[PDB]
Amino acid sequence: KRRPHAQNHAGYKIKYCKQVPLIPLHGGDYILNHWETRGVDRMRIPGIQHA
Amino acid sequence: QNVTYKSVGSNYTCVTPVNGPGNTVMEPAMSVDPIKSASLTYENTTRLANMGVEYYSLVQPWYFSASIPVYTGYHMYSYALNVGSVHPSGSTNYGRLTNASITVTMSPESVVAAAGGGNNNSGYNEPQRFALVVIAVNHNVIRIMNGSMGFPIL
Amino acid sequence: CTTGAGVTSGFIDLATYDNLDRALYGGKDATTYFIKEHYPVGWFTKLPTMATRVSGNPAFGQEFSVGVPRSGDYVLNAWLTLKTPEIKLLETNRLGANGTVRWTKNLMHNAVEHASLTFNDICAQQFNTAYLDAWTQFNMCEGKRIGYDNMIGNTSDMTNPTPAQGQDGARTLPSKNLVLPLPFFFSRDCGLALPTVVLPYNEIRINIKLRSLQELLVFQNKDTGNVIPISATDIAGGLADTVEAYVYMTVGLVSNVERCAMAGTVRDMVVEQMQAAPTHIVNPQNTNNVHVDMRFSHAVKALFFMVQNVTYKSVGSNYTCVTPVNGPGNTVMEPAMSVDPIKSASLTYENTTRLANMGVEYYSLVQPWYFSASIPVYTGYHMYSYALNVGSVHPSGSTNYGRLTNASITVTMSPESVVAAAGGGNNNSGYNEPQRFALVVIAVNHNVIRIMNGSMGFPIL
Amino acid sequence: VEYYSLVQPWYFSASIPVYTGYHMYSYALNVGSVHPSGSTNYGRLTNASITVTMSPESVVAAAGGGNNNSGYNEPQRFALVVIAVNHNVIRIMNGSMGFPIL
Amino acid sequence: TCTTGAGVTSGFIDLATYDNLDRALYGGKDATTYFIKEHYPVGWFTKLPTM
Amino acid sequence: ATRVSGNPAFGQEFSVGVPRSGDYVLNAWLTLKTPEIKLLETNRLGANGTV
Amino acid sequence: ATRVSGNPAFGQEFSVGVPRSGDYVLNAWLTLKTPEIKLLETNRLGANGTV
Amino acid sequence: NTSDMTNPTPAQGQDGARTLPSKNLVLPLPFFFSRDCGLALPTVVLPYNEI
Known part of the structure; x- marks a missing residue:
């Protein structure tokens, strides 16, 4: 009778746990682009206006 | 249920x-x-x-x-x-x-x-x-070989 | 709702991977979804066409024959239309007050027996009521069942018994046209189509034998539930042996790039x-x-x-x-x-x-x-x-x-x-x-079926 | 809450x-x-x-x-x-006040 | 082995939020950080009530 | 779907953006809860009136 | 906090694994929903009984 | 101890038939990392532990 074939080695299951960054892919939203930032006016002369 | x-x-x-x-x-x-x-x-x-x-x-x-x-x-x-x-x-x-x-x-x-x-x-x-x-x-x-069945990876 | 999952939740599912996943998915030659391969197809068109009658005038209880028109590269669809007569019972019927008249179950798939399709003068195909019933009851695509049961009769109106004029139910069976598709080898699949342009030396013809209206109408007894044959004097207007019935077939036109290329070759x-x-x-x-x-x-x-x-x-x-x-x-x-x-x-x-x-x-x-x-x-x-x-x-x-x-x-x-x-x-x-x-x-x-030299024949027979 | x-x-x-x-x-x-x-x-x-x-x-x-x-x-x-x-x-200079960034 | 996903997307978004005001208030190599307490030795002594 | 314009209301038109940071988007459905309807005897049709 | 041993129950011991993948865990608390208590008239003390 | 759980309730037959309310209670867990902000678990620095 032929020898049965089956998995014998238990493999290498490394203990503890690993990590993945879990970072947003593009990040186009949730974040502005240094422009149209509400509450601030970029097109302003430096504070020498009160000087 | x-x-x-x-x-x-x-x-x-x-x-x-x-x-x-x-x-x-x-x-x-x-x-x-x-x-x-x-x-x-x-x-x-x-x-x-x-x-x-x-x-x-x-x-x-x-x-x-x-x-x-x-x-x-x-x-x-x-x-x-x-x-x-x-x-x-x-x-x-x-x-x-x-x-x-x-x-x-x-x-x-x-x-x-x-x-x-x-x-x-x-x-x-x-x-x-x-x-x-x-x-x-x-x-x-399921792997079939040598006239038998089994799970290669289980 | 408050969905805090976000897109990033699936990164763990993407990251998890083992030998089973490597065996199933992955690989350089593995195909991917979200990308559909497009391939060109032939340039053609389709349109309905009247079929040419060549045998007198159709009538009930008789056989009428209709040829297949030329000028179409392929024919791949055939159906029949027939306008049923108006039926109204009379109080002077044999059954008297205790008597109703109704159309038989499956009015279509009935009155059409031994319908045949012939090439030249050789019987190529032929079917009848039993085959029609079995095929439409076994290979019915669900969703179109209501349409079929509304287009071949059994519309819960033609099959309802109607009492005499003097009784409570004086309704008359409506005279509405009905349609029956003809199951043929070319109509089974689009890939199988008749090369009319390639077969000019054979007369492709369709022979349809209707049924006498005497056995198309069920004359039921109200109480004892007995059935007797219907007579002309029983119903108003008599029985019209003649009837207007037509056959429609769909033709397809293709460009010269292949309609002439495929000609002159033996096709099986x-x-x-x-x-x-x-x-x-x-x-x-x-x-x-x-x-x-x-x-x-x-x-x-x-x-x-x-x-x-x-x-x-x-x-x-x-x-x-x-x-x-x-x-x-x-x-x-x-x-x-x-x-x-x-x-x-x-x-x-x-x-x-x-x-x-x-x-x-x-x-x-x-x-x-x-x-x-x-x-x-x-x-x-x-x-x-x-x-x-x-x-x-x-x-x-x-x-x-x-x-x-x-x-x-x-x-x-x-x-x-x-x-x-x-x-x-x-x-x-x-x-x-x-x-x-x-x-x-x-x-x-x-x-x-083999097509060669502008004619068709069975190589095996 | x-x-x-x-x-x-x-x-x-x-x-x-x-x-x-x-x-x-x-x-x-x-x-x-x-x-x-x-x-x-x-x-x-x-x-x-x-x-x-x-x-x-x-x-x-x-x-x-x-x-x-x-x-x-x-x-x-x-x-x-x-x-x-x-x-x-808030910034104080030149005898006056104002927001440098607002 | 497991598969864990490092920090939270909301925390990453908050960290990515950064402007001139935040650059002025925080940041810099010389800036101290919390979650780390400096330890220095203390004198050794004992106490006792006395009549 | 990324809400970027107004709020839903009956008889008005609102536009909603498609979220980014996704490799592929292949589906879309809209959910809405029906209000509550109660009939009153003060209707113009009186008793002979249904909604 | 991720659970690792069944569900909490009175008179039983349960373990909870600290969620890893963070940077600094600095505070923890336990919330518990008390049941509903309703005394009946069939108690042993009868009328002279309080819960 | 909010004069509700700790206040005795007589049986249904007596004047006091109120039921003890079922609400949620929160208990902070006194730990060395919770004692001070400067003391916190370096979870990022500890990948080979199971807390």
Whole structure:
């Protein structure tokens, strides 16, 4: 009778746990682009206006 | 599944069926699935949020199945584009994934049917009990060689 | 709702991976979804066309013939339209007040028997009412069932019995046109189309024999549930033997890039034909089993066998053991006792039984569940299939009967049929009068049709 | 609601309210500390929303029908108020004041 | 082995939120950090009530 | 779907953006809860009136 | 906090694994929903009974 | 201890038939990392532990 074939080695299951960054892919939203930032006016002369 | 009586079977609604006119089974007025919402959790990271029960009931079978149930209950969630397709499609392996959890929320109809006191021919004339069951479908590889069968990877 | 999952939740599912996932998914040559490969197709068009009548004027109870028009590269669709006459009962009928008139069940699939398609002067295909019923009950695409049952009659209006004019129900059966598609080898699949441009030396013709209106109308008794033949004087306006019926076929036009290239070459096509065994009369009172010898020629694919109640010629498509009777509410109801007369069936080759005496429920439910696209919703309609998919145009497993010797089918009848054959039933019991049954066997086989030198013939025959 | 009412005030606030309401949430480790701590700049953030769920007592007290000396003898109306506390920079020079960044 | 997902997307978004005001208030190599308490030795002594 | 314009209302038109940071989007559905309807005897049709 | 041993129950011991993948865990609390108590008239003490 | 759970309730037959309310209670967990902000678990620095 032929020898049965089956998995014998238990493999290498490394203990503890690993990590993945879990970072947003593009990040186009949730974040502005240094422009149209509400509450601030970029097109302003430096504070020498009160000087 | 309602488990109040062992004789009855496949009673997945919150109220047991009762006898009706014309010697026919009649579903009482209050008969809805006890589940109100459900969600998944992966080691403190909710992959699926507290979605509505109607989502699993209708939207998922509409897109990733071949039929829609005609009875209350029967909620599913499939990682694959086609459930009935034997050819493999999108899926996740739980061997390399740690403990995962399913969370369900009851309904006011369920909590009011749990206590008895209902009038005659209402189904909930006696206190009602429920049990939650989960079934999963997975893939495997079978190797045929040397006139024998076995699992190469188990 | 408050969905805190976000897109990033799926990164864990993407990251998890093992040997099983590597074996199933992945690889440089593995195809991917979300990207559909596009390939060009031929440039063509389609449009309906009138069929040219070449045989007098169609009339009920007669045979009329219609040719196939030329100038179309391919024909791949054929149907018939017929405007039913208006029926109105009269109080001067033979049955008197206790009498109703209604159209027979499946008005279409009836009045069309032995419809044939012929090339030149050679009979190429031919089907009839039993084949039509079996095919439309076994290979019905669900969703179009309502459309079919509204377009071939049985629209719950034509089949409702109508009492006399002086009774409560004075409604007249409406005169609305009805349509019946013609199942042919070219109509089975788009890939199989008749090369009319390639066959100019053969007269492709369609012969259709209608049925007399005498046996198309059911004249039911109100109380005792008896059926008698209808006469001209019974109904208002008489019976119009002539009727306006038309045949429509769809043609397709293609460009010169291939319509001339494919000409001048020998083409071999596979088609599906019909073979019908002679009908045998069965009397369950005397015998409990009946053996029928079946002889066929080419590679058979399926066998449909049913037992039909033939007590009255007016009623059709009645495979039950008890005839239908009138019911309350001016509607027809199946009687309380109505079960298929066949109790068991078996198949024998030579003296060896390939199939044992299996139960009727096997052929009724299990075989359609596995090797068909639908399951019949009416009693009867028993099928055996040698192929995995009956409705598949591509050939599947099939056994040739040309090299196979005599084969037999044995049907053991049911006690319900035995007791229904004898009369004695009370009013509206269906089997008040003695019942007679007949056995019909239909087979479906493949064939090869060759087109060469502007003519077609069977290379095997 | 008990979390906002009690937990965060217990952990990283100066005291705990003694009345019903006043639900707070602060990114900083000490609201009373003048020194800056962890905080987010809503200028560079996209649209942000706050979702609040009412209570059965509120929905039953919104309508009238209450008996005498019950408070809700007449139909009651409610409003929602939200206040935000942030940081800013002020500059003093040339005998005048103004915001360098505004 | 497991598969864990490092920090939270909301925390990453808040960290990515950064403008001139935040650059002035926080940041810099010389800036001290919390979650780390400096330890220095203390004198050794004992106490005792006395009649 | 990323809400970027107004709020839903009966008889008005609102536009909603498609979220980014996803490799592929292949589906879309809209959910809406119906209000509560109660009939009153003060209807113009009186008793002979249904909704 | 991720659970690792069943569900909490009175008179039982349960373990909860600290969610890893963070940077600095600095505070923890336990929330518990008390049951509903309703005394009956069939108690042993009868009328002279309080809960 | 809010004069509700700790206040005795007589049986149903007596004047006091009120039921003890069922609400949620929160208990902070006194730990060395919770004692001070400067003391915190370096979860990012500890990938080979199981807390």
